[PDB]
Amino acid sequence: QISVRGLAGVENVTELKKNFNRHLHFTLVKDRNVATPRDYYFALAHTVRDHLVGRWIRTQQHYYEKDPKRIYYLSLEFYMGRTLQNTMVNLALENACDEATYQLGLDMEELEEIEEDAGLGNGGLGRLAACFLDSMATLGLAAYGYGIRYEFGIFNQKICGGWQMEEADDWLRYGNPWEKARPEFTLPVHFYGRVEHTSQGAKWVDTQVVLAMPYDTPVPGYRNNVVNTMRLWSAKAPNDGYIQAVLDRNLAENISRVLYPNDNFFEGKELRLKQEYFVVAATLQDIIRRFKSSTNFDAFPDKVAIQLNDTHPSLAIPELMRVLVDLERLDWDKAWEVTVKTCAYTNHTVLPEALERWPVHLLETLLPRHLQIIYEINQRFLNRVAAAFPGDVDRLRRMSLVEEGAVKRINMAHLCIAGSHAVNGVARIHSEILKKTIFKDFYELEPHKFQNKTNGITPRRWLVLCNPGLAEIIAERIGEEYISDLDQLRKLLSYVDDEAFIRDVAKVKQENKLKFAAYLEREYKVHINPNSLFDVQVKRIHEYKRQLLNCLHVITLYNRIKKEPNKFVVPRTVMIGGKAAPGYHMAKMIIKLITAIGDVVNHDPVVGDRLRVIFLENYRVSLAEKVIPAADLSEQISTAGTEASGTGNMKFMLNGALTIGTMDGANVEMAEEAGEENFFIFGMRVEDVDRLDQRGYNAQEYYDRIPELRQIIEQLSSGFFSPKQPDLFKDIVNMLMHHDRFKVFADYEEYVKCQERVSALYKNPREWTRMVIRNIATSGKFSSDRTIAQYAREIWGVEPSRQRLPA
Amino acid sequence: QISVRGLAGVENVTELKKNFNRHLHFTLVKDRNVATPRDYYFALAHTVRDHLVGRWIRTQQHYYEKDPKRIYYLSLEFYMGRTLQNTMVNLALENACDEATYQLGLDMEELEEIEEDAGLGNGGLGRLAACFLDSMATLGLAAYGYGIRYEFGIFNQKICGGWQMEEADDWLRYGNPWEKARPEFTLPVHFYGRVEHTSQGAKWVDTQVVLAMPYDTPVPGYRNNVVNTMRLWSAKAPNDGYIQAVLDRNLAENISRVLYPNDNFFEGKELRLKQEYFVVAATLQDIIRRFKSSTNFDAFPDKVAIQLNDTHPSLAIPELMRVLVDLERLDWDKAWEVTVKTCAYTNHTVLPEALERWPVHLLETLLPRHLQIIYEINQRFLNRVAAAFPGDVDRLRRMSLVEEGAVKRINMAHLCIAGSHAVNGVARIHSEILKKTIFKDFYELEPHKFQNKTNGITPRRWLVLCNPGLAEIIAERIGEEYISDLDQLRKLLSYVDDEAFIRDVAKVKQENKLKFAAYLEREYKVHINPNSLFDVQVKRIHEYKRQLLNCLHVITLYNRIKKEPNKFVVPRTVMIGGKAAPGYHMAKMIIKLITAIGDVVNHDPVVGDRLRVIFLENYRVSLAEKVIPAADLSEQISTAGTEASGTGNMKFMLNGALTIGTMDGANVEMAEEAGEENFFIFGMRVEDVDRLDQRGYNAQEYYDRIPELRQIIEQLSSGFFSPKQPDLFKDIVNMLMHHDRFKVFADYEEYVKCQERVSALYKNPREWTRMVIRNIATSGKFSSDRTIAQYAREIWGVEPSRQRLPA
Ligand SMILES: OC[C@H]1O[C@@H](c2cc(O)ccc2O)[C@H](O)[C@@H](O)[C@@H]1O
Ligand SMILES: OC[C@H]1O[C@@H](c2cc(O)ccc2O)[C@H](O)[C@@H](O)[C@@H]1O
Ligand SMILES: *Cc1c(COP(=O)(O)O)cnc(C)c1O
Ligand SMILES: *Cc1c(COP(=O)(O)O)cnc(C)c1O
């Protein structure tokens, strides 16, 4: 047992054991003679859950009595991962439960692996919402996460013949012990219909009704006895030939059936629009209901803050207006004032293919009243623009919420800026780019609205939970206060020359690598050398993230070895993992390329154990918790200006891996905090990318001047990596040579050179670890607690608290 | 008084004072009432000189008794600089003399400034010979420096209208107290004539005779009581209408009149050839004379080692053969064996315009016998090549000592390789380049001959003498042993975190900068800001050294300031100094450009004291001793592969300045010793340069893709820096754009970026100094004591000794 894992008191261990047996008997209806590991997992989950209830009920009762300003975080994604360990950590029950299960003759680690990941998200945006809920609870904010309870989350990825195969993520199959259905709070949501203009106001009639049933999941703060709520809505058909009518109920319930598996890509499908309005409509009614139970809505913004995670829940703006104007009968101007002061919008990308632009004909059929409200909002907004910039007709066209052309569309991002009192980017460089390019016109009109809130990650799940060994050696030196005040890691700088510490940090990493190297053989049949440098790139597969650049390097290393076999080179295990969106052809071709390279490299006798290429299958939160602690090198090589922030980069930094990356997103602030000398930065900066675009990017030029690059392209083209199918990678080569939007070749030389400097430092164990300590010691700024404290003070207008609520 | 400067004993101070007064009276024939500072300088010089005599006579007597192997270093250049302080340092008389002169009411520092530099050299090659003599004496080797006593050394440089003006360096005007004329050892040297082939051997007859009169100068080792000799020959006409015949004696004496002012450039003038044979002929007779007084010449190589400093003294090979064969009557094969085992050759450059290729018609008229011997050597050599590489006729052509064509020439470098048992480069990268390119054929034939001997500098003149403050704070921590065992500076690494040391190192530098900033106003009328970063590039003006790249950066800094005047930038004083060879037009245009930039930059009100451009006039050894200790940034930016070694770079490193440079010459080994992280490396490596040449260097490409570079070129072309003469710099621009052999534009971007990282570190005083300490601490390898110990053991076959000879 380690200190950070809490006390294993005699009274508590005894209590846990009896409650465990009580649940196994009464709850699971089983006896030790027929119970399986899954049954044991559930008995434990129910036991731990019992400890949350008391705090959950009192926290909510507390908010009712004190009536603080409530924070509503609306998101279509909450990438939660597993809940058992995180709950034990936040309640300081980990050692007690470890001990109790030990005494019952069970291995708690084994049971934890049985829990299904709650994969209600795609990647960064979804996991950010999850980290935020943890921090909001840890900072004592009266916050509520609101989203959709998808029956099927992100698909489970299977690799067949080196190709990605998708299969339904039936995460609710065995039940979810963490959620509590609240059928009594079911609310109606309207679709279609038409608008009627009577004497006293407009009415939305003849609508199709879909019920929204909420499921509440507890969100415990870190050892402060605060337990907030994440409310997820489930679609249900109202109860009102016969057989077919009953079977068609599934049409309405399909709304909460599956999570769209696109990350950073907009797909204008009706079902997706229905999901977006569904979460918005149910949530707002719940918000208003709670408010009226605290009617002049003038105080609404003083009691309510609604944070829009990207534009997905943007309909909250016109829906709030609809309710205040049509139902509460407030005048437009009063309603608009309340709406703007209540809403805030967070942008997460600048890529054009990711911005939401809904066809007017769709909103026209599905939400006729909202379209009218949007036109009105647009009308009044453009009048403000016209008055501020008289005669600038092109500005009017550029700022309009309505986009003209082949098919009229509504720019949801413009709608969010107009209807929010605050708009923020997620990293300094990203926020600046927003003001300089994408939202320049809006920034000129209302400079005060634009802010920055650099992303962060929770040190609970991303350090204590996944890397106990590191959290322990750190605690031994500076105590445990850093877990909820990560800035204290700075105190570790005074140990950079401490021989003992250096030895421990290195030891922890080695243990993590052995543990992971073992895991890889266990549940996947792959052997790797634990002494090699663990070079990993895990994140969704996308061209802008440039897994292809990583591939080029790997192939370069291979060609160099084959060129001079008996020459020494630092051993490396190159691990790449991530899912590709089902309809993203190029993403799927890249995965194939990666496995294809592995097929060649991993079986070349001459390479030996000096180079290994492994594709990490089904990358997800639970897997991230395993690979990150075991990494030595973190690949964050997106083309400068494309990765808004990135969060995986922060996880790696906090866990003892060095970073090789471009000056993109949060990498810039990370390098700034640790010192550029302690980072492996390379490639074009944003400015260099623009210059190249002015000039015109011609990949052929690099192909002609770099022999090693040429050799690689010719290997791909000739079928060196695809014997049976010589032209298998023709699309990739064609893209790289003629239409590479991300300039892979432009950063190749500097990337390869930078990688050489990495290998050089790895040869000096002591100095590599010392640099590691300098990174870990300055990763404090990247805690989501800092991020949330900034949102709270600069946007929501509430003060975070570290005060413990009574037991 | 500081410790490293020795003891100021009461008996010695009293003795020095009386001897000072004795010389002022009896030697200078003056009294205190009419004595000027110069008279005082001479009284002091004679007093210090008296202390050398006893040791000088005993050292030579010692070599006579013990009869060790003698080392003869032949060089046409010995860039000695001043001798007074160096002598006091090596005899540990500095404090005593400081005290004694103080008591007589005189400032010793003032008197030292009166001594004329012995400028018998151009640059690096000449100063290397000087450092070598110091180290050979310090290592107790029986070594003799042999050269020419030029009446006029390197010209004194005057800047008029921003242009270089040359004026005779009449360094002997007031007399040289250090030398001792030895008219009794005068030797005859022959020129012209013809060859007669009699029965028993060939005879060189009807020659013109020129006498060689030697002047001996003492070379004291560091506190070991060893005093070696530097013998310099002076040309004298034999004593045998009347008036004109007497006046024409000057024709013969013109041989030792002036030093050719070319550095790294071959000028095939007859007078230069006469100088080369003159030093060789007189020296060899002296060597043989001394040997016969120690006749089977089989032991000659066991008692004699002749080191050829470049090809300038290459005629030593055929001259030795001439003497052994024609005069001593040894058979050719025996004579050749002795010659090869006796001679060793050091190459100092790979630039084609620097290699000596003498026209056959000149050697034919001036040295008919030597030409015959050279043909014979060539003949027998090519027979060896033919036998080793049968049928390779092109190799025969490439290796021939005789070059065919428009005008037959003799490749002196090929002659040296054939007639020497050892050939060495002066830095690892240079030595490798010799084996891979320039002398590849020779390396293949005789791989054993090729070696490397990385250059070094003497820590006596280049640390103790010019930077007493630094030598003192170092001695305070690790003692004084490092002065003759520089590797001990490593011990300073354990003080890199020592707050006291950091403060002292920084303090010493600040004092040096104040001292120099003051000097600049004193004897030159220029004011500078002592708080700015001292950015200096001092060395001979040449295109390969790329002072032009430095200029481009300076202009860039200026344009950036003018662009954003109120933006903060680290203040800089950019100092550039160096002489241009009289006939090197481009070199003279670069000097003009530098002063022209200064004229604009230094008088722009907006720049203020943030940027200053100063051209250091008349750069020479005595000036180097002043600027180097005061530098913060050392510019060593030659195009990769062109600077064989460089030595100025080492001086700066030993004196606390950081280095920004290319991976050229010794810079590579310096970075390797200190760690690349503690060096500011940038630009193309040798390999990148070759790739560019394969491809074809097109400067226009850089001009088109870099706006800042374009702006600079257009400023130069339009006359921005030359109002009255708008096209004044047309030649420079034309060269840069169409025929730049050194690829200035190719390294511009990376250079400017690297300079930004320098400015960034300078903003952090503590970390800049810590990096400085890491440099100084690892500069040990660059002591000429290490270099000479390697020559001694690996080439000359003698063991260095640190044993003190009796008083
Ligand atoms: O802000 C959390 C992360 O959100 C990511 C994201 C943005 C979207 O518009 C859609 C999906 C998605 O995962 C950005 O790519 C990351 O850079 C950023 O760190
Ligand atoms: O070896 C001492 C230095 O000799 C220099 C030199 C070489 C020549 O062939 C002629 C003159 C001259 O000064 C090289 O340029 C330096 O790189 C080298 O460090
Ligand atoms: C942290 C995380 C991400 C975000 O990673 P980036 O590299 O910033 O894209 C995506 N997926 C999972 C499962 C994560 O844990
Ligand atoms: C050391 C020295 C040199 C050689 O300098 P580099 O930069 O190596 O060319 C030339 N001249 C003088 C006066 C020197 O002291």
Curated annotation (Swiss-Prot), chains A, B:
Question: What is known about regulation of its activity?
Answer: Allosterically regulated through the non-covalent binding of metabolites, being activated by AMP and inhibited by ATP, ADP, and glucose-6-phosphate. The activity is also controlled by post-translational modifications including phosphorylation.
**GO terms of molecular function:** glycogen phosphorylase activity; nucleotide binding; pyridoxal phosphate binding
PTM Phosphoserine: at which residues? 3, 400, 484, 717-718
Give the record's PTM text. Phosphorylation of Ser-3 converts phosphorylase B (unphosphorylated) to phosphorylase A.
Q: What class of enzyme is it?
A: transferase
Mind telling me which InterPro entries this protein's record contains? Glycg_phsphrylas, Glyco_trans_35, Pyridoxal_P_attach_site
The record lists AMP as bound by: 31, 64, 289-294
List the catalytic activities from the record: [(1->4)-alpha-D-glucosyl](n) + phosphate = [(1->4)-alpha-D-glucosyl](n-1) + alpha-D-glucose 1-phosphate
Top-rank taxon: Eukaryota
User: What are the record keywords, sorted?
Assistant: Acetylation, Allosteric enzyme, Carbohydrate metabolism, Glycogen metabolism, Glycosyltransferase, Nucleotide-binding, Phosphoprotein, Pyridoxal phosphate, Transferase
Q: Which parts of the sequence carry Phosphotyrosine?
A: 192, 215, 443
Cofactor(s) of this protein? pyridoxal 5'-phosphate
Residues at the site labelled Involved in the association of subunits: 97, 131
Biological process terms from the Gene Ontology for this record are: glycogen catabolic process
Please list the residues that carry the modification N6-(pyridoxal phosphate)lysine: 651
As for what it does, the entry says: Allosteric enzyme that catalyzes the rate-limiting step in glycogen catabolism, the phosphorolytic cleavage of glycogen to produce glucose-1-phosphate, and plays a central role in maintaining cellular and organismal glucose homeostasis.
Similarity comment: family membership? Belongs to the glycogen phosphorylase family.
**What is known about its subunit structure?**
Homodimer. Homotetramer; to form the enzymatically active phosphorylase A.
The record, for PANTHER family, names: GLYCOGEN PHOSPHORYLASE (PTHR11468), GLYCOGEN PHOSPHORYLASE, MUSCLE FORM (PTHR11468:SF32)
| The protein's name in its UniProt record | Glycogen phosphorylase, muscle form
Species in which this protein is naturally found: Oryctolagus cuniculus (Rabbit)
